[PDB]
Amino acid sequence: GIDHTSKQHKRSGHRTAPKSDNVYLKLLVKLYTFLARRTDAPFNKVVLKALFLSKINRPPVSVSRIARALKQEGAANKTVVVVGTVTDDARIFEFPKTTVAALRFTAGARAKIVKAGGECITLDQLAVRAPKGQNTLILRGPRNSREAVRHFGMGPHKGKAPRILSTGRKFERARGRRRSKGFKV
Amino acid sequence: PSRFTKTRKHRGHVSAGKGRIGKHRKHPGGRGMAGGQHHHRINMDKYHPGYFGKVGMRYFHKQQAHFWKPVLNLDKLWTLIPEDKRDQYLKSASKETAPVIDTLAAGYGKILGKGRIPNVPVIVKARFVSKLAEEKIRAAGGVVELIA
Amino acid sequence: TLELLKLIEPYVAYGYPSYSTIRQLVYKRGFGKINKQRVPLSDNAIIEANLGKYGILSIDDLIHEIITVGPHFKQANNFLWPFKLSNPSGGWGVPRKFKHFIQGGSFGNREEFINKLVKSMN
Amino acid sequence: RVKANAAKRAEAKAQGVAVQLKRQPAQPRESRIVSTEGNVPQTLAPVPYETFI
Amino acid sequence: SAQKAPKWYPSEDVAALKKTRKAARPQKLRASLVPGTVLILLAGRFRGKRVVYLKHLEDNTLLISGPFKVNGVPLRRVNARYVIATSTKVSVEGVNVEKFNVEYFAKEKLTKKEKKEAKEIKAERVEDQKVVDKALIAEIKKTPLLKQYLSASFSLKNGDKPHMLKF
Amino acid sequence: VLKKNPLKNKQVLLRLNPYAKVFAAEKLGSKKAEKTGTKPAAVFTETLKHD
RNA sequence: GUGGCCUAUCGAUCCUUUAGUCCCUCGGAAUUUGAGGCUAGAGGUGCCAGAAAAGUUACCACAGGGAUAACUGGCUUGUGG
RNA sequence: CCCUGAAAAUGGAUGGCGCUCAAGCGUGUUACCUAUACUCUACCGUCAGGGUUGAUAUGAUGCCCUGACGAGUAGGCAGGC
RNA sequence: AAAUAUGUAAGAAGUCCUUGUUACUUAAUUGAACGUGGACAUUUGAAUGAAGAGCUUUUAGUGGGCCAUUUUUGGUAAGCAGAACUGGCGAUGCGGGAUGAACCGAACGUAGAGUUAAGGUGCCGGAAUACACGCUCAUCAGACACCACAAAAGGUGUUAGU
RNA sequence: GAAUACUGCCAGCUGGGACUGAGGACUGCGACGUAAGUCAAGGAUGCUGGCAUAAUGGUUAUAUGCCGCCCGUCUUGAAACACGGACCAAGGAGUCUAACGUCUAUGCGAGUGUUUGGGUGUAAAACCCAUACGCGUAAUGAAAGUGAACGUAGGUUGGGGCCUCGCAAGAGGUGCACAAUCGACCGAUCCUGAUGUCUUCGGAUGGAUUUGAGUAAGAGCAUAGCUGUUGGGACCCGAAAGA
Ligand SMILES: C[C@@H]1C[C@@H]([C@H](O)CC2CC(=O)NC(=O)C2)C(=O)[C@@H](C)C1
Ligand SMILES: [K+]
Ligand SMILES: [K+]
Ligand SMILES: [Mg+2]
Ligand SMILES: [Mg+2]
Ligand SMILES: [Mg+2]
Ligand SMILES: [Mg+2]
Ligand SMILES: [Mg+2]
Ligand SMILES: [Mg+2]
Ligand SMILES: [Mg+2]
Ligand SMILES: [Mg+2]
Ligand SMILES: [Mg+2]
Ligand SMILES: [Mg+2]
Ligand SMILES: [Mg+2]
Ligand SMILES: [Mg+2]
Ligand SMILES: [Mg+2]
Ligand SMILES: [Mg+2]
Ligand SMILES: [Mg+2]
Ligand SMILES: [Mg+2]
Ligand SMILES: [Mg+2]
Ligand SMILES: [Mg+2]
Ligand SMILES: [Mg+2]
Ligand SMILES: [Mg+2]
Ligand SMILES: [Mg+2]
Ligand SMILES: [Mg+2]
Ligand SMILES: [Mg+2]
Ligand SMILES: [Mg+2]
């Protein structure tokens, strides 16, 4: 017998492969597995781990987010890397000439980036021209902006959104929500 | 598909995953929202505060078409001009030739002010407009023409 | 540590090891904890690879850092995996183990007799 | 103790390096020579039982 | 197809063996086994026969000629673990045994075609046996009762405990 | 592939600890000590024999 | 000094009622009653997180329970002997 | 220590036979017996950490190296028939 | 006024030196809190360990318990009823206690070899009818904890002792 | 003045027995040798014999030694003097639907959804499509209503990755996601009340131990799957009753 201080046969809890059957994604995973093994650059390891992520853990990254990231000093000539989708944004009216490498570009995002003088690039061409992740800039999208996150942690005084179908007066705005009707949360 | 469900996996195991003690029964706590004030009170008050009681005043025969008023912010305002003319209108900001935007034709009731339009004068026709939105349009050099 | 031993006394037998006991224990049952794995020593280069910053270049250096409680005792001792000993070859010598060694049992402090016990246990 | 530790390090920065700030637990005693001269050992055995009531 | 296919097949190329670090060193015989020692055969068709140890062959076999003129055992090899070396010794510095070796006792090449339904000794062995055994007899007759002792067959009596018997 | 114990297999005992050759060549495990004629004191002997 | 020297001395939803803002609504447009809202008290649930509630059944019924009594056994032995 | 105190109902229980300088009682020294426990080795599986592309090496959900681990109702999940 | 149990601290989110902010504070250019800059070196301020550390969502069964050591209430008591801490059983085989949910030993993939635990070694039954010092003779001996009970009281039985 | 007991050490020598031989070109650490080589040094070889078939081995029946209580179920506790079960075949119990939560996959993404319908067709398929409509891109308030940049869309503290100097140790710089915190903005509540004037309207600025399921360079929509939820006969079978 052994006095087990820890739970036995415990899986790491991390994805080691994409959950999908996309063969082109699996080819990208194979390429960045080779790069994350034969190169010591932590960029290839971070890109490889991001290639395993689910959809909610790969939020889209807008072109306005990319332009804001390019307003940083020393980052004008960098290569923006989005392991996921670059969506479009009409809120902006100027776009810098830059190189963006991403899994997917929406039609609007690709048009805006190309019209700005830049180029859209896949992660394999990213690997070819920047094998060690030279002057790259990895961007991620907002994960807690998801609508499901609003209801996480519901409870008294937590200030969270109830899981509700119909919204308005007569829908959970009474006893328990105001002092005049019983109490307030 | 049934072949992927846990019902197939429970074959040969007596209780079908329901327990030998609890012994899956018909409606052990009542049907629907039974006991919302009595034995489901903790769940109701924790997850749905505000459920019980009346708040506000009634509206007999409410027609939602009276309250039709889609809102549009100034940042999305320039999306109403088609892209074939958007670049041309964006450059060479003219006081004598400014784009006319019929937001009502685009299906909007009130123009709001989430901000930062370029300093290009535009005519913005709207039914309702917010104070800050009209200030921002006039700051850019445009005008708001109220319509009905 | 003495209060720790005074608190687990009914479950352990401890004492003061000699140089021969420590040397034979490390040579025969010494495994290192390297990258969370239990690695048989079997070579000076492994001990130098894991304890070389502490100036411990060989198994004899490890033995000295144990017999004389040196500055790097804590690192050398934790580098050693807990020794897995066999049951004593001639038995425990007592009818019942779970009395104190003073009371004719086996547990507690048996200070210099731990050498004979451990030698029979490995 | 924080002030005292700073004082010890401040002195050691000039003279007497390796001031060894950390506290240590009670260490085992070192060797010694217990002189008998004037301290001849003398003690008896256990004592018989007496009623004392 | 009744069974689909295996997508990948094992390679049929046989693997070579790793180099083996086991050298052949000469066998170290027991202390009691010295030439001219009277042994007792414990197994074989000549069980319980007192024999004379003559030579140590290179295949870890003892060349014994338990005198054929005395007890009818020829020049033959035995395994050292199947004999009991007794204290009695006979001189052998009058005999030559260098001719007898493994190639001398190379038996035959039997054919698989050959088969036996129901049912001689080579020429050279007889004169070799006589020539070897002559000086063995001459040495034996120097002290009395060896001829009778070799003629007699060893056996275990009732209550004879070999774990305390001195041979 | 296989743990070979020292304290036997003198090849492995010599792979580790190159001093073991000098230890054997000099019989340091059976070193004879220098004779010393330092007597105990009378007060020690009398205390030991005291009841 | 935001009641009682401290540790007890008390009460949701719906409904009614009062106070406050003199404010919002009655949806074709106004005025005045009337009604409905918003904020804060009261009217009471003592089974005190709060149904509106008399019995009988030896004429009885059903689901159950050895989760629970009445006979035997078991432990105990006050009481009995 | 032994004896008296010491009475229950089918025939019966140091487990049985039996046991008296014990095969009883108190104590002590040794030797010996044997668990799925401990040590070493092999094999299965699981988990973890790694290696493997100047064409891999064959399909890199493959091959391989290294270490540790394995009880299980109710129940969860996985891979399969 | 203990023992056991129990709170906190043992630094980098730290310490020190200047001088910055403010509508708070001071009689005040006094403090308070938060700072800029500077200094502190690898023992960054006890020990041991750390099996990865943090974090989140969502959902099953369960919501009859029972036993033991110790503490403890009611009861004459109970294999009674009720609490406290811990370990167990339930959910669990294996060795030992003949037998037994819980006691002792030890927790379990499939095998081999060795060694032991608890318990034993006359025979059943594997293993000393071992060794040593004594005690006991019962016309109801005694013979291993849980555990399958014994008392007040008495004996020129016998042994040791005051 | 010695010996011995006892205890301890040897990187002292050696005899007998038992189980195991995993891996499969080489690489390493070594040792003996002037080297060249050799070896017991990252896991067994060499030699020999018999048989080559029921001999070994498998299955099966039996015998022998030891062990083994009847399953399922409720239960703290079942071999129970608890219940169901004489035997066998066949049938026999978590399903489908509406709406939905978390997670995952896929498409497109500030959008998304063809299939109400029209067109067409090799005709319940496949293919093509307008306008709408749903959800989403704005919240808040009971409501009338009003409605999201002071600032590189803020400051502070961490923070992966990247950039520079570095052989490295490290040092700076930039710092997405995320976490904590102080702010700003929008709505509600309370307050303050400028120019102006149908003299009662309007509500500019400025506040707050207040409040919101908000803003602060969007993340959603649609389909599918396991799991969970509610209504449905609702896992299957079962009342005493009521009409
Ligand atoms: C006893 C009297 C009435 C009582 C209350 O309104 C009774 C019930 C009536 C009803 O049908 N439904 C409810 O939710 C409450 C109340 O408030 C007291 C102060 C005054
Ligand atoms: K009735
Ligand atoms: K195990
Ligand atoms: Mg069944
Ligand atoms: Mg379940
Ligand atoms: Mg059931
Ligand atoms: Mg109630
Ligand atoms: Mg033994
Ligand atoms: Mg009212
Ligand atoms: Mg019961
Ligand atoms: Mg009585
Ligand atoms: Mg199960
Ligand atoms: Mg229950
Ligand atoms: Mg249960
Ligand atoms: Mg018993
Ligand atoms: Mg115990
Ligand atoms: Mg026997
Ligand atoms: Mg049996
Ligand atoms: Mg049963
Ligand atoms: Mg019974
Ligand atoms: Mg029943
Ligand atoms: Mg029946
Ligand atoms: Mg039937
Ligand atoms: Mg069937
Ligand atoms: Mg079915
Ligand atoms: Mg039914
Ligand atoms: Mg009725």
XYZ file of C-alpha atoms (C1' of nucleotides) in Angstrom, chain J residues 73-234:
162
model
C -33.215 -6.873 -3.991
C -34.432 -3.262 0.118
C -31.067 -2.455 4.161
C -26.499 0.011 9.256
C -26.436 -5.143 8.753
C -28.654 -11.249 4.204
C -26.573 -17.804 3.685
C -30.825 -15.956 6.541
C -36.131 -18.532 10.408
C -36.777 -11.199 5.057
C -39.139 -10.991 0.034
C -39.130 -12.635 -5.855
C -37.407 -16.969 -8.332
C -40.023 -25.085 -10.329
C -37.990 -25.247 -15.616
C -37.280 -23.429 -20.879
C -38.183 -20.452 -25.410
C -39.774 -15.954 -27.358
C -41.336 -10.909 -25.987
C -40.057 -7.376 -22.059
C -38.515 -1.261 -19.416
C -34.839 6.534 -19.797
C -38.122 6.933 -25.739
C -39.905 10.958 -29.166
C -41.482 15.984 -29.118
C -41.838 21.716 -27.852
C -38.807 25.128 -25.490
C -34.162 25.671 -23.043
C -28.758 25.710 -19.783
C -23.305 24.305 -19.991
C -19.792 22.170 -23.146
C -17.981 20.684 -28.180
C -17.832 20.602 -33.799
C -18.960 23.298 -38.395
C -20.264 27.666 -41.673
C -20.275 32.734 -42.023
C -19.335 36.695 -39.173
C -21.520 42.943 -37.262
C -24.063 40.142 -38.979
C -26.641 35.688 -39.282
C -30.708 32.306 -40.612
C -32.568 29.454 -48.504
C -36.729 25.410 -47.583
C -43.876 30.626 -44.965
C -43.477 31.114 -49.985
C -41.740 31.654 -55.276
C -38.617 29.452 -59.327
C -37.074 24.901 -61.268
C -36.507 19.783 -61.504
C -34.077 13.383 -63.674
C -40.260 15.343 -59.076
C -41.711 14.425 -51.253
C -34.803 14.712 -53.484
C -31.276 18.114 -55.661
C -30.429 23.217 -57.285
C -31.780 28.760 -57.317
C -34.225 33.305 -54.841
C -37.036 38.601 -53.514
C -39.222 41.139 -49.559
C -39.854 40.592 -44.850
C -39.265 38.331 -40.029
C -36.451 36.262 -35.650
C -32.098 36.784 -32.849
C -27.883 39.953 -32.441
C -25.115 44.823 -32.945
C -27.844 49.652 -26.380
C -28.885 50.335 -21.954
C -31.902 51.948 -18.154
C -36.646 53.278 -15.750
C -42.986 51.590 -13.009
C -43.473 55.128 -16.686
C -43.272 59.827 -19.360
C -38.535 59.521 -21.136
C -33.266 60.051 -21.727
C -29.343 57.250 -23.756
C -22.760 55.595 -23.768
C -14.460 59.034 -25.473
C -11.580 64.642 -20.765
C -7.606 61.448 -22.063
C -2.827 57.645 -27.883
C -10.745 54.594 -25.143
C -7.463 56.541 -18.700
C -4.059 55.563 -14.334
C -1.743 51.626 -10.905
C -0.223 46.401 -10.074
C 0.796 41.797 -12.170
C 0.863 39.375 -16.934
C 2.258 35.134 -21.958
C 4.640 36.375 -26.269
C 7.674 39.827 -28.914
C 12.048 43.938 -29.417
C 17.126 45.661 -27.848
C 21.709 45.044 -25.174
C 23.430 40.633 -23.448
C 27.924 34.114 -24.222
C 24.862 33.303 -20.305
C 22.899 35.332 -15.457
C 20.156 39.290 -16.270
C 18.733 44.136 -17.606
C 15.654 47.483 -19.825
C 11.280 48.491 -23.616
C 6.341 46.947 -25.527
C 2.892 44.659 -23.224
C -3.019 41.077 -26.181
C -6.227 37.616 -23.056
C -7.062 37.559 -17.862
C -7.107 39.240 -12.374
C -7.282 43.213 -8.616
C -8.010 48.367 -7.925
C -8.879 53.929 -8.524
C -11.236 56.776 -12.230
C -14.276 58.564 -16.679
C -19.153 57.824 -19.565
C -25.001 56.125 -20.143
C -29.839 55.203 -17.522
C -32.544 55.404 -12.495
C -32.696 58.015 -7.368
C -31.491 62.245 -4.427
C -29.496 67.264 -4.850
C -27.684 72.176 -7.254
C -30.268 75.353 -10.535
C -26.965 79.462 -15.671
C -28.421 82.160 -20.258
C -33.358 82.366 -21.652
C -39.255 83.132 -20.943
C -46.362 81.969 -22.999
C -43.608 83.933 -15.251
C -44.002 78.721 -15.645
C -41.636 76.321 -18.863
C -36.790 75.007 -19.979
C -32.415 72.350 -17.631
C -26.669 74.506 -18.723
C -22.949 73.273 -15.391
C -21.738 70.829 -10.959
C -22.114 66.774 -7.243
C -23.326 61.486 -4.419
C -20.702 55.967 1.804
C -26.892 55.607 -3.612
C -28.675 52.261 -7.824
C -28.588 48.940 -13.231
C -28.980 42.091 -15.860
C -24.784 48.847 -18.896
C -20.174 51.797 -22.087
C -15.081 51.810 -22.216
C -12.034 49.460 -30.988
C -18.373 44.763 -31.065
C -19.571 38.317 -30.854
C -23.275 36.823 -32.616
C -26.507 33.953 -35.594
C -27.478 29.032 -37.589
C -27.055 23.700 -37.784
C -25.456 19.221 -35.278
C -23.955 15.962 -30.851
C -23.505 14.055 -25.573
C -25.321 15.652 -20.779
C -28.890 18.264 -17.812
C -34.160 20.890 -17.235
C -39.629 21.540 -17.739
C -44.395 20.089 -19.998
C -46.070 15.812 -22.195
C -48.428 8.230 -20.830
C -42.603 10.474 -20.086
